[PDB]
Amino acid sequence: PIHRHKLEKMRALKYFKVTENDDGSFKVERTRDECPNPVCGAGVFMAQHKDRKYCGKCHLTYAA
Amino acid sequence: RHCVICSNQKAVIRKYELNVCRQCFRENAANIGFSKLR
RNA sequence: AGGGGGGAGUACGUUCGCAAGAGUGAAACUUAAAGAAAUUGACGGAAUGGCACCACAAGACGUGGAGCGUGCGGUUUAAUUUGACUCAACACGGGGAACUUUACCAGAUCCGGACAGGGUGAGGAUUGACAGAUUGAGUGUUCUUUCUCGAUCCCCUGAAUGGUGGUGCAUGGCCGCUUUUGGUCGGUGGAGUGAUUUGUUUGGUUGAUUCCGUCAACGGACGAGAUCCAAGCUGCCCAGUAGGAUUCA
RNA sequence: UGUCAGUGAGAACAAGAAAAACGACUCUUGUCGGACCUACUUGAUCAAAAGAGUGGGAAAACCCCGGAAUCACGUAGACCCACUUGGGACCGAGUAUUGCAAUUAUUGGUCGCGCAACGAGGAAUGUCUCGUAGGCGCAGCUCAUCAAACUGUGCCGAUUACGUCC
């Protein structure tokens, strides 16, 4: 009774990436780590995996 | 090769003088102006 | 003398006969036809008249047993996909196929399952995704990570479409062959109860139901012939990519 | 094998038919050349296979639009009645070419093996009477690439019969 590959994933976000930078006294800063030089603006953020970071959409090599 | 008036690619493709009419046989599919008299 | 066909001229009895046999003569059981005549087809080691180097004569060239290519059969194998088998199978399926083509085999994938009518919008079963893993496939299918998200993709039914799957004995179209010969059919009239026949017939001629003649047939329609395509000779057209003639050189 | 006859050379001489165009670049007020062939020259101060540049064509233009096989040849060529110097099929090594991918795919190539078969081949059986049979070559076809196949054109070109129905 094995279907092998393909299943439901249920993943990605919840209410996470809720808003931009919170404000109304001073700006406090994002959940994650920055993306230098995206082409879709800085609303994209980079992975934490193996001390490397990677942009899942603009596909850059940048590390921490 | 491959054919453009079928997608079969088998039952033989004519590419002589830049035409295909042998994946739909020309006896059935005439009015190309050809005739037999001899 | 006979009362469907077999059983049977058998059985039993009885009379005749030297014997072989003769006369008389059932039943049990079984079967749905047996039989008569004529007609139209097919076949004949039947007859007659004709026609074909797919028939033969005379005789030129091969195949048939070698070494090769190709197809088929057999066996084999994971699969050795399959149609076709005297001729109208077998260098055939315009089929000289290696991955593609591909039926078939070894594995993975897609939605094409569209169509939401019964459900999940945001954050979904999702679209796209580096690394890690998955696995032949760092492939992003998948699973983890994290990112990119239209809400179409996704959930359940019904519905669906796609197919080189079978059936050519469901079928259309097309092709092969019967048949490369001269054959085919109706109206009106004649004959027969009818099925049928005459027309389409003795003779000669021709590849020819091609002709002339004749006749219970008369007048017709197709195939044949002819019209077409190509070749050989030629007129007219006729010249700058067609090619020669004379002189100058 | 002696009626191309087997290895060498030179001469004269053939006909249909195939081909081209990518939304790919560049070009403008609405757009041109590259996937076809063949020519010519380097490819020999040193092979073949094979590299590249220039040049023309949509074909009666493509260089003479058309050529080398059958054939001719005594140039006083070589072989010479042998399974060979007649034939190839197996087999190993090398290299270049084609392609999305080659696993002899490549194959027009080198050079081994040939002294591996086979000597016109039992019975049986095929099809043609004239420019035909037979012999020979070329192109088209299929298409990453290969034709002992198929289709078409041309060349050399007879013997017998022109009767019968067995």
Nucleotides of D under 7 A from a protein CB: 18-21, 140-144
Q: What tokens does B36 get?
A: 């037999």
Exposed e or buried b for every residue in B4-34, given b needs 16+ CB within 10 A? eeeeeeeeebeeeeeebbbbeeeeeeeeeee
Residue B18 structure tokens? 């830049």
DSSP string of A6-64, one letter each residue: ------S-SS-S-SS---SSS----SS---SS-SS-TT--B--BTTEEEBTTT--EEE-
Sign of CA pseudo-dihedral A44, A45, A50, A51:
positive
Bases in strand C with any atom closer than 7 Å to a protein CB: 93-95, 101-103, 108-110, 123-131, 134, 141-149, 164, 173-175, 228-230
C-beta neighbour count of A30 within 10 angstroms: 15
Resolution limit, Å: 4.0
CB proximity B15–strand D (7 Å threshold): yes
Q: Are A34 and A45 in contact (CB under 8 A)?
A: yes
Domain ranges of chain A: 1-64
